[PDB]
């Protein structure tokens, strides 16, 4: 049997699936630690590894990439979970090693690859406290090229009134996603600040893990694939739209929760955003 994780329903994704919008033919690059393509509940369409030492993008020795990928597109079937856009074309862009670490230039090469290969959506469920002009240049190039870019806001919590959003989420061109639980309460670790654009479910997120397992993780990095998958359903309904319209729809149709400093524009609602 298959279970629909609570967050897939909380952002109102089943509504569009009922209407026949499941993300078909939309291409989503999951820039992360790889995706185990043999998981029976994932179908991976391609990818490329930027990590020198682990040249196979379909080998996820860390787990993070496979989990993020499952939230974006776990298949609709009799097993496991269901993704926000279960028919999306999933591409594993490996920029992080088995220890979950990455050099910014591997990350930039990942993004360049995504641009060259005409990705529609890029998900970066990763963040550092530092940025680099090269990193802003790659992210801004992607958005200029018409790609929807979504990134985890960071799991740094509150530092009084200091913004704690990390990079690349802190860049205006990137949609920075924070984490709420089932009751739309901000998770204590979720980074806060003026650069936070929307919130998605990020606490006890059941998704796929390497070796035909499933498991629940917490993080803004679990919030982010929910908004990348929502960008994929909007475009499967309106193939038509630019990354600028998809971003605006997501931001303008949110359920406003508390203060923007903590919640940005609020909880995305992809049924309202897809028009
Ligand atoms: Ca499934
Ligand atoms: Ca931003």
Domain range summary for the chain, segments of one domain joined by + = 1-275
Q: Report CA(240)–ligand 2 centroid distance (Å).
A: 24
**CATH number for the domain formed by residue range(s) 1-275:** 3.40.50.200
Q: Is 77 annotated as a binding residue?
A: yes
Using only C-alpha atoms, what is the Rg of the chain?
16
Q: How far apart are CA 267 and CA 270, in angstroms?
A: 10
From CA 241, how far away is CA 260, in angstroms rounded?
27
95 alpha carbon, distance to own chain's centre: 15
Sign of the Cα pseudo-torsion (226, 231, 128, 106, in order) = positive
Whether the bond into 168 is cis, omega within 30 of 0: yes
Task: Tell whether 140 is in a known binding site.
Answer: no
What was the resolution (in A) of this experimentally determined structure?
2.4
Q: How many residues does the chain have?
A: 275
Is residue 37 a contact partner of residue 80, using CB atoms and an 8 Å limit?
A: no
Phi then psi for residue 130, to 5 deg, are -110, 155
Q: In what order do the strands lie in the sheet with 175-180?
A: 44-49, 89-94, 27-32, 121-124, 148-152, 175-180, 198-201
C-alpha of residue 7 to centroid of ligand 1, in Å: 15
From the candidates 17, 39, 60, 64, which is the catalytic residue? Answer: 64
Active site residue 17: no
Encoded tokens for 275: 């028009």
**Distance, CA 4 to ligand 1 centroid (Å)?**
8
Nearest Cα neighbor of 7 from 71, 64, 65, 87 is 71
Backbone phi, then psi, for 225, in 5-degree steps? -55, -20
221 catalytically annotated:
yes
211 dihedral zone (left: phi>0; alpha: psi -120 to 50; beta): left
Strand partners, 162: 159
Place of tokens 């979950």: 100
Active site residue 64: yes
- Dihedral over alpha carbons 54, 58, 61, 65 (to 10 degrees): 110
The distance in angstroms from the start CA to the end CA of the chain is: 31
* Gap from CA of 142 to ligand 1 centroid (Å): 31
Which residue in 17, 36, 181, 221 is the catalytic one?
221
Residue 81 assigned to a binding site: yes
């Amino acid at each position: 049997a298959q279970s629909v994780p609570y967050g897939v329903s909380q952002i109102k994704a089943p509504a569009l699936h009922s209407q026949g919008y499941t993300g078909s033919n939309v291409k989503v690059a999951v820039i992360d630690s790889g995706i185990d393509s043999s998981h029976p509940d994932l179908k991976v369409a391609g990818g490329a590894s930027m990590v020198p030492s682990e040249t196979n993008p379909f080998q996820d020795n860390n787990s993070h990439g496979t989990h993020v990928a499952g939230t974006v597109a776990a298949l609709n079937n009799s097993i496991g979970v269901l993704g926000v856009a279960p028919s999306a074309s999933l591409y594993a862009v490996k920029v992080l090693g088995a220890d979950g670490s990455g050099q910014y230039s591997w990350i930039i090469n990942g993004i360049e690859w995504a641009i060259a290969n005409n990705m529609d959506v890029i998900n970066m469920s990763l963040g550092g406290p530092s940025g680099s002009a090269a990193l802003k240049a790659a992210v801004d190039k992607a958005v200029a090229s018409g790609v929807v870019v979504v990134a985890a806001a960071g799991n740094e919590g509150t530092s009084g009134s200091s913004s704690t959003v990390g990079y690349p989420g802190k860049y205006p061109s990137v949609i920075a996603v924070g984490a709420v639980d089932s009751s739309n309460q901000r998770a204590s670790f979720s980074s806060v600040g003026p650069e936070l654009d929307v919130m998605a479910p990020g606490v006890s997120i059941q998704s796929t893990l390497p070796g035909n397992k499933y498991g629940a993780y917490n993080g803004t990095x679990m919030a982010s694939p929910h908004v990348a998958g929502a960008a994929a359903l909007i475009l499967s309904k309106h193939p038509n739209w630019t990354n600028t319209q998809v971003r605006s729809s997501l931001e303008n149709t949110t359920t406003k929760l508390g203060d923007s400093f903590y919640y940005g524009k609020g909880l995305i609602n992809v049924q309202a955003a897809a028009q």
